[PDB]
Amino acid sequence: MPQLVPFYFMNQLTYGFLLMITLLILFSQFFLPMILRLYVSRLFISKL
Amino acid sequence: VSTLIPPKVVSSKNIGSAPNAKRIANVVHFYKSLPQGPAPAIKANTRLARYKAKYFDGDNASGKPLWHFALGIIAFGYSMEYYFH
């Protein structure tokens, strides 16, 4: 199958694993903590 | 005999009850409170702050942006089909 046999396996795969590391960092430092703002904000609202 | 001096001494009723904690919270929160919050998102400008405003605001979540977003990717590969064929 040409979609499972290019010669570009390592080329593709390099760009692929780069996307994973990017997203991991992106979630971890940015996007997960902005939901945690919703959680904490709710608990402060809970206090008031 | 001569009355004791407690009734005329007060100085720890201000930690003595629970709404003191709430009071010191809501003197800060409400005193510097705004009448209304700032924003429900508004940036994406380039004639696309309108795209976000119509579709990705709190006003509605409807299938129109989905269709639009789908169609962009369809337009890419459909043109490329004739680049491949």
Curated annotation (Swiss-Prot), chain A:
UniProt membrane topology term: Single-pass membrane protein
Signal peptide: none
Cysteines joined through disulfide linkages: none
Main location: mitochondrion
InterPro entries, alphabetized: ATP_synth_su8_fun
Record keyword Membrane present: yes
Record keywords, A-Z: ATP synthesis, CF(0), Hydrogen ion transport, Ion transport, Membrane, Mitochondrion, Transmembrane, Transmembrane helix, Transport
Pfam families: Fun_ATP-synt_8
GO BP annotation list: proton motive force-driven ATP synthesis
Membrane spanning stretches: 13-32
Subcellular locations according to the entry: Mitochondrion membrane
MF (Gene Ontology): proton transmembrane transporter activity
A GO cellular component entry from the record: mitochondrion
Domain of life of the source: Eukaryota
UniProt record similarity statement: Belongs to the ATPase protein 8 family.
Function: Mitochondrial membrane ATP synthase (F(1)F(0) ATP synthase or Complex V) produces ATP from ADP in the presence of a proton gradient across the membrane which is generated by electron transport complexes of the respiratory chain. F-type ATPases consist of two structural domains, F(1) - containing the extramembraneous catalytic core and F(0) - containing the membrane proton channel, linked together by a central stalk and a peripheral stalk. During catalysis, ATP synthesis in the catalytic domain of F(1) is coupled via a rotary mechanism of the central stalk subunits to proton translocation.
Subunit structure: F-type ATPases have 2 components, CF(1) - the catalytic core - and CF(0) - the membrane proton channel. In yeast, the dimeric form of ATP synthase consists of 17 polypeptides: alpha, beta, gamma, delta, epsilon, 4 (B), 5 (OSCP), 6 (A), 8, 9 (C), d, E (Tim11), f, g, h, i/j and k.
Name of this chain's protein: ATP synthase protein 8
Curated annotation (Swiss-Prot), chain B:
One BP term from GO: proton motive force-driven ATP synthesis
Any one cellular-component term (Gene Ontology): proton-transporting ATP synthase complex
Top-level lineage group: Eukaryota
Keywords, comma-separated and alphabetical: ATP synthesis, CF(0), Hydrogen ion transport, Ion transport, Membrane, Mitochondrion, Mitochondrion inner membrane, Transit peptide, Transport
Cellular localisation: Mitochondrion; Mitochondrion inner membrane
Main location per the UniProt record: mitochondrion
Assembly: F-type ATPases have 2 components, CF(1) - the catalytic core - and CF(0) - the membrane proton channel. In yeast, the dimeric form of ATP synthase consists of 17 polypeptides: alpha, beta, gamma, delta, epsilon, 4 (B), 5 (OSCP), 6 (A), 8, 9 (C), d, E (Tim11), f, g, h, i/j and k.
Described function: Mitochondrial membrane ATP synthase (F(1)F(0) ATP synthase or Complex V) produces ATP from ADP in the presence of a proton gradient across the membrane which is generated by electron transport complexes of the respiratory chain. F-type ATPases consist of two structural domains, F(1) - containing the extramembraneous catalytic core and F(0) - containing the membrane proton channel, linked together by a central stalk and a peripheral stalk. During catalysis, ATP synthesis in the catalytic domain of F(1) is coupled via a rotary mechanism of the central stalk subunits to proton translocation.
Other facts: Present with 14600 molecules/cell in log phase SD medium.
Family: Belongs to the ATPase F chain family.
Protein's name according to its UniProt entry: ATP synthase subunit f, mitochondrial
Organism whose genome encodes this protein: Saccharomyces cerevisiae (strain ATCC 204508 / S288c) (Baker's yeast)
Complete-protein stretch covered: 7 to 91 of 101
